[PDB]
Amino acid sequence: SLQFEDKWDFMRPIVLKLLRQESVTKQQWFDLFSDVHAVCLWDDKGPAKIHQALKEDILEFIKQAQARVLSHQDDTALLKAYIVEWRKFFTQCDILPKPFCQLEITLSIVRKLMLDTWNESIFSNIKNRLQDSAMKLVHAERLGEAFDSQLVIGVRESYVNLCSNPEDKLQIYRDNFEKAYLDSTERFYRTQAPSYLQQNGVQNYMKYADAKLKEEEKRALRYLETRRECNSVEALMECCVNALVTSFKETILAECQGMIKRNETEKLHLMFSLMDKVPNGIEPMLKDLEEHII
Amino acid sequence: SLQFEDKWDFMRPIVLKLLRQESVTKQQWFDLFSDVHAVCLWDDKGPAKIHQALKEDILEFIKQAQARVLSHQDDTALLKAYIVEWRKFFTQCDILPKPFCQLEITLSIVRKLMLDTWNESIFSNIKNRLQDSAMKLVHAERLGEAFDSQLVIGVRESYVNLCSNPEDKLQIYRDNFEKAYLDSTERFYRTQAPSYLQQNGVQNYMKYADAKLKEEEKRALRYLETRRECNSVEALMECCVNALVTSFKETILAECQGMIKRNETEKLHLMFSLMDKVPNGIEPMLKDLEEHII
Amino acid sequence: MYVKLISSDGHEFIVKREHALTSGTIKAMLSGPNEVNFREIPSHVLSKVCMYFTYKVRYTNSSTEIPEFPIAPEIALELLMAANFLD
Amino acid sequence: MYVKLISSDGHEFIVKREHALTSGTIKAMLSGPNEVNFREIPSHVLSKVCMYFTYKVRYTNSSTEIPEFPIAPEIALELLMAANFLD
Amino acid sequence: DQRSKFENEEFFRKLSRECEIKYTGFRDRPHEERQARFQNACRDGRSEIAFVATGTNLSLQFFPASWQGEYVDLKVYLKAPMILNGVCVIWKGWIDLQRLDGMGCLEFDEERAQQEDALAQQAFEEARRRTREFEDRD
Amino acid sequence: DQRSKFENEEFFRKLSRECEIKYTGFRDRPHEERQARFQNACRDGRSEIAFVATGTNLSLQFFPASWQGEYVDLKVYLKAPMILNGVCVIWKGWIDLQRLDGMGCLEFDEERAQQEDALAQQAFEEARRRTREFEDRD
Amino acid sequence: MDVFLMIRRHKTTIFTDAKESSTVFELKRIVEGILKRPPDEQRLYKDDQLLDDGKTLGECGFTSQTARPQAPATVGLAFCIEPFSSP
Amino acid sequence: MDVFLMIRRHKTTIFTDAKESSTVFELKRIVEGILKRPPDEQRLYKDDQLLDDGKTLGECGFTSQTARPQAPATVGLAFCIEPFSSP
Amino acid sequence: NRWQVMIVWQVDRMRINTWKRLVKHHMYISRKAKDWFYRHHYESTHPKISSEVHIPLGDAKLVITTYWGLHTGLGQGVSIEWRKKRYSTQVDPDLADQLIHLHYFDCFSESAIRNTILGRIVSPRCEYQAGHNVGSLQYLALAALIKPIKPPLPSVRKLTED
Amino acid sequence: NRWQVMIVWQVDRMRINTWKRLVKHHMYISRKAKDWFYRHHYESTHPKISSEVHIPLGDAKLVITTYWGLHTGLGQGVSIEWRKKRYSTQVDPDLADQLIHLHYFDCFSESAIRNTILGRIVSPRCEYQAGHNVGSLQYLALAALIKPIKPPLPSVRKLTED
Ligand SMILES: [Zn+2]
Ligand SMILES: [Zn+2]
């Protein structure tokens, strides 16, 4: 009575509409639910035929999207097309696996299928390009040219989500793009800090350092992943502090006596904040305080 | 102004009245309190003179009481005289040391003085006689001739109280009279049980054993010391059980099968009570119960 | 906050929200693109399904004594079909 | 249940029982053979002694802040004598 | 998980209602000696004592630890550490003498919850949650 | 002794009245970042936090165990084992986020009361009870 | 322990929760207010008695033993009853 | 926190305890009943006001600040006042 | 005075002797319980342990202990435990039955739903009805469609009752 | 995250610096405190321990610890302990003073009551008035009869206040 071939003809258009990010309706969605359950139950080979049809449609749409994406030879155009297409694809991959709950139970495999297909289609070939473009955009942003944050956020979340390695969810992401981010940020502060310190002054350097620390914190909160914070944000601002304040701790302790004999409130707040970061930085200013005591 | 010699003349009669178990008055008692405090304070050697006068009067009265006690050459007359005199003396020793609280604080030594004086006066010479007479009275009582329990109770409490050795309060008492009590009771049950078991019967032996156990428990509660129960009552009924029921456990286990095939309620209660006493008496009756099961 | 479960004929078996989410397929159905349509599940099955939903949500922790669910064999096969779809 | 503390002149300074037992000599005096006679302790010191009894029994656990006991030096030596006798 | 099972599961809901407990024993025997036996059994660790919780057959029972191969307390103290139903609990039901009656309630055992084995607890929870029906592959 | 000191001594009478506590800190700074610092300091053991008990200078304070040479809890849990005034106590005063306010109370530490050294406790009690005045012999 | 009741309003089959000692007033305000049906221009028609008119605790405090989860009672509402599907 | 008061009945100097919000009725029944003195054939004579006649909470709820352990207030009684001894 | 606390359920002798009979019959005569163990009291020096029916639930093991001289239960008792490598926890009768059914007794296999829905036969059944303490509606429906041993199966909810 | 809890009393920097001055003066210049000890902050690697005044109370020892960077106490703190052979207990200021007075500073002797009662002189006196937190009526009377250092004695109740 009920077989895969008797209803797959009606099944396919709704699957394609869900896949290709098109407008859909609730009633058709519930009819699709009932149809997939009935085909999974009655037909002896119904689940297998459903799975192979799903994989065929997934592969076809992934090939179409990949062909569209590779059309843009320009790096920035390719980046914007890739982020738009990935956002729509990821919304679909969040929506798509819900109908095939009966298929999943009998044998989510659908979400893994989508993620792996998109990965092996596009990510495996343009991961390096996306990475370098992301660092270029983020370093331009840190220079003072604000850009579209959603692009870098989507790049990062594609890195965290499309990790084929099942040992850790964010293994490839954390051990490639996160460490590249730390190295890039460290080199930017290494290039920038001595010039500002030598030119603008001392208290100017401290206030600029505080402002840049706040900006780096907010950019770590927004750009860098915060769903799990797996040694990412902590490593980022730890490298920031060990590249700025641990770097110029000699200047800080040199001016510590001047602060002690001059009673700067902002500098006091700064060193109170920075005792915790330095593993053994407490002793300079506390010994200066006791020299005041003695 | 105030000296020992100026008021000891008035002090002495009230001390003697308190000592010799005579009628006294509250007002004289409070005047004695005030006088002893004033003499202890003002006179430089007042406390020492008070102490030596007290020791002199204590020794004199103890000598008088000892001379009175040794007058009765008869063992029973000496027993009754000794218990009466000791009861009055111990009441005084409970009452006497309260007035000399100031004397005690400046240097209860009074209670120890009374106890040691009476001990070295009378107990050191008639302890063996009192012990053997107490055993005679207690074994006559267990035979069925009820006697004056207060005599043996006073003997026991004099043993517990007049112990000169300060390592333990009841050491001499517990390791002389208590062990003599255990030995006497054990020999009495050893002499009595086999005859009744052979003559009266089996269930008669069990009911008599229960009745005698209850009687021994009540006599341990009354006669034997219960203020501390320092390994005394536990040792007593433990020796009773290991001389009666642990002794005839072979007969008990022989009749256990008869009970199991006859369902005696009183025997059931008796064995249920006696499981805990015997270290390994559970196995016979429970193996018989399983033989019923098997 | 209730969920409206429209049966095949058109009966509405509106049930408290927290009861309906005991079945996985309902949870997956509400998500994505109230109103839920059950054309294969008629009254004499959906009624008992929602009733079992209430019975299960309340008698799930009471470890003392849980009374059984007496259901007639006249609807038992259709009820198994509904429990295979929803649950 | 109170204790009647008759002073030298004849004043009765009847105090709650639980207060009076804070002094050892009172405890030893009541025992054996109410009524207690204080011929060497007159009003102007016995009053302060019983008053200190109340003050001490109530302000003995309050570790927060215990106010001091202001007593005039005009009666201080007799009060030391009474505190040497009773306490 | 265990910290939340207290407030949802019904076994401890019906147990931790400040329930009444009563020492069962030699009720056939005279009360005077029944109370005497209760006292001389509670004082020492050479007997056994039970508490029937006044109505059901669910009764706690205490045995000397020498019979086997946070500590327990037996004045009027009846501390009981036990992992009831896989979740650690503590029972502080005192008893009243001269009446052979008392109260009882359960409390969470935080120390063992933070110190007992975690892999074993997870294994027990997994084994308790799952169901045998429709499990074996056919 | 310690089991009775709770109900008579006044230090714990004034402490175990379900007292209000408030985290002191960077109040000069804004409330939002103050909450952020409270959260990121309470979550991890690399800072310090205090609670002033709303009115006095008697404030608890937590320093990480790495700074030095029954365990503590820091969700909204603030278990604190400490022998206050010679008698073991336990403090279970939770805090409320988004308001920097909370509650507090003390409870007896039975486990340490039955497991801490007895000779040292007796020595401390003897040293606490006695008085220096009229002691040295002259 | 409470008793679960449900509404049979013509085509509607509201399934909800009721307390053991609920009053008609609180029953009408919210419990049957899912379909935005305030007591105005409406009257409950529980069986033939119709639960009187309302504000009555004599019958609204129905026992939990008559309406067990397996077969809880009906109430009904209007301003008819749809027959359930037959096997 | 309460306030401690004493009775000065001619020769008698009852020392006892009073609560902060005590009423005259409960003060007379037991607190001054140590010498078996019921309110019948007696009236308290607190200072000149004599605490009115009784059953008054306006003044009987005396503050604990006015009377302290070191120096508590007096009440007095009759149906005179003995002077304390002088140094 | 040391002391260990063990929750027990007073049980009339009848139930315990019939449970012992059933366990010993199933373990040896039948084949359903050929995997369990048995420890009598002469190998258990504990003064009250009368018997122990050991259930090797795979990695862990359930142990049911019966007592001899409970105070007017002559009065016996039962206590159910889940012992696993020096980690022992008490367990109520319903959960003990549920854990027992997880391994030994039979149940409609995963392929026992589509077979009955489409009218085919069902190969395995559920002889341990008592091992299903509420279940999924599929279970209730299937048990109604397929309504379920001459020597009764050993359950621990029949025992602790009364 | 490991964590240890220690009760502290917020104290203004004045009180703590004047207490340090008094302790260092009495220990070295005076002879009343020639028995105590002192641990500065450079020999204490703890990030907040600023100073420790060690009081060898015979067999046991009292230890008073001062803190550097309390959150707006720059804000210091103090915590009083009675450490004895790996058994450390917290102690309130009044009890700390009482235990301090038990050994170090001289106090009326046992022969200081009859001497004043009879009018003779009193040889020892009580310079640690603050060490007497209520006392026996003999103490109150004697202190009134004999009403009591130019460099003030170090007390721990003057400090924790405010
Ligand atoms: Zn089954
Ligand atoms: Zn002093």
Numbering used by the authors:
A (entry chain 2), B (entry chain 7): 12 to 118, 133 to 319
C (entry chain 4), D (entry chain 9): 17 to 49, 58 to 111
E (entry chain 0), F (entry chain 5): 7 to 75, 84 to 88, 94 to 157
G (entry chain 3), H (entry chain 8): 1 to 79, 89 to 96
I (entry chain 1), J (entry chain 6): 3 to 75, 81 to 140, 143 to 157, 160 to 173
Sentences from the study reporting this entry:
Human APOBEC3 (A3) cytidine deaminases are antiviral factors that are particularly potent against retroviruses. As a countermeasure, HIV-1 uses a viral infectivity factor (Vif) to target specific human A3s for proteasomal degradation. In this process, Vif adopts a “double-hijack” mechanism by recruiting cellular T-cell transcription cofactor CBF-β and Cullin-5 (CUL5) E3 ubiquitin ligase complex comprising CUL5, Elogin B (ELOB) and C (ELOC), and RING-box protein 2 (RBX2) to induce polyubiquitin chain formation on A3 proteins for subsequent proteasomal degradation. Vif nucleates the entire complex by directly binding four human proteins, A3H, CBF-β, CUL5, and ELOC.
The same cryo-EM data contained a class of A3H-unbound dimeric form of VCBCC complex, which was reconstructed to 3.5 Å resolution. All three Cullin-repeats (CR1-3) are visible in this form, likely because the Cullin-arm is stabilized by the additional contact with Vif from the other molecule within the dimer. The architecture of the VCBCC complex core resembles that of the previously reported crystal structure. Vif α/β-domain forms a globular core with CBF-β by forming an antiparallel β-sheet between Vif β1 and CBF-β β2-3. A small Vif α-domain with a zinc-coordinating site mediates the recruitment of ELOB/C and CUL5 through a three-way interaction between Vif-ELOC-CUL5, which is typical for CUL5 recruiting SOCS-box containing substrate receptors.
